[PDB]
A paper describes a structure:
[name] enzymes are capable of removing acetyl groups in chitin, chitosan, and CHOS, thus converting GlcNAc (or A) units to GlcN (or D) units. The protein has a somewhat deformed (β/α)8 barrel topology that is characteristic for [name] proteins. Next to CHOS, [name] deacetylates chitosan, chitin and acetyl xylan. X-ray crystallography yielded two structures, one for the substrate free protein and one for a complex with (GlcNAc)2 bound in the active site.
The structure of [name] without (GlcNAc)2 comprises residues 42–241, meaning that no structural information was obtained for ten N-terminal residues (32–41) and five C-terminal residues (242–246). Note that both the N- and the C-terminus are located on the opposite side of the protein, relative to the catalytic center. The structure contains a Ni2+ ion coordinated by Asp56, His105 and His109, which comprise the metal binding triad that is conserved in [name] proteins. The Ni2+ most likely originates from the protein purification by nickel affinity chromatography. The Ni2+ ion is in an octahedral arrangement, involving three water ligands and the metal binding Asp-His-His triad. It has been proposed that one of these water molecules, coordinated by Asp55, is the catalytic water acting as a nucleophile during catalysis. Superposition of the two [name] structures reveals that the water molecule coordinated by Asp55 in the substrate-free structure indeed has a position that could allow it acting as a nucleophile during catalysis. The other two water molecules, which coordinate the metal ion in the substrate-free enzyme, occupy the same position as the oxygens of the acetyl group and the hydroxyl on carbon 3 in of the sugar bound in subsite 0. It is worth noting that the superposition shows little difference in the conformation of the above-mentioned amino acids.
Author numbering: 42 to 241
Write the structure that this text describes.
């Protein structure tokens, strides 16, 4: 996909994997749609086959650190642990290395980011599903606030994401968008480590 011309949107899911991730992957599969999963390293240990699904079925795996700590609260070595422990978990699980990282709570800063070997990927559309856990509100906010180049934040922690996705994909397609991984979204642009990006 050429997102320089084509109207692209990236669906992203934080804080997984968990008990709903496979249903989520099933729904995404049913509508031939890729997504980007910013995974928690602590959770990855328990879900190796599910991470293999992400690779096998066209999705992108990103790092969300290991135990979801605000990285700006940490020391240099603390940040090292969060990055490296998560990478090891992802490599052991799926045989790949993430190429992007999303900082917990969106919290970051130049002095910290310089320690992160990947582009920092934020978002421009917060579905707020972490507060309301409501599938229809997730769809409404994602649909109405998305624009070409948007990155939509959702959470793989709760049933409402599973219930939201079939409708969310349908409506984004009907609204003229092509759904892509974060990699595809930034393909061709200057997408470099230790920098933060919230939109193409
Ligand atoms: Ni998170």
């Amino acid at each position: 996909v050429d997102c320089a011309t084509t109207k692209c949107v990236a669906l992203t899911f934080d804080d997984g994997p968990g008990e709903y991730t496979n249903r989520l992957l099933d729904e995404l599969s049913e509508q031939h749609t890729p997504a980007t999963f910013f995974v928690l390293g602590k959770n990855v240990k328990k879900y190796p086959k599910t991470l293999k699904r992400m690779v096998d079925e066209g999705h992108q795996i990103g790092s969300h650190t290991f135990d979801h700590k605000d990285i700006t609260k940490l020391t240099a070595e603390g940040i090292e642990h969060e990055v490296q422990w998560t990478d090891e978990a992802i490599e052991q699980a799926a045989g790949v290395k993430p190429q992007i990282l999303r900082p917990p709570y969106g919290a970051h800063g130049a002095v910290y980011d310089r320690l992160i070997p990947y582009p920092l990927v934020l978002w421009d559309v917060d579905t707020l599903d972490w507060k309301h856990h409501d599938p229809q509100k997730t769809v409404r906010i994602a649909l109405e606030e998305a624009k070409p180049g948007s990155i939509i934040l959702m959470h793989d922690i709760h049933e409402s994401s599973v219930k939201a996705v079939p409708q969310l994909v349908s409506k984004l397609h009907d609204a003229g968008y092509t759904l892509v991984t974060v990699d595809q979204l930034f393909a061709g642009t200057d997408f470099k480590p230790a920098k933060a990006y919230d939109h193409r």
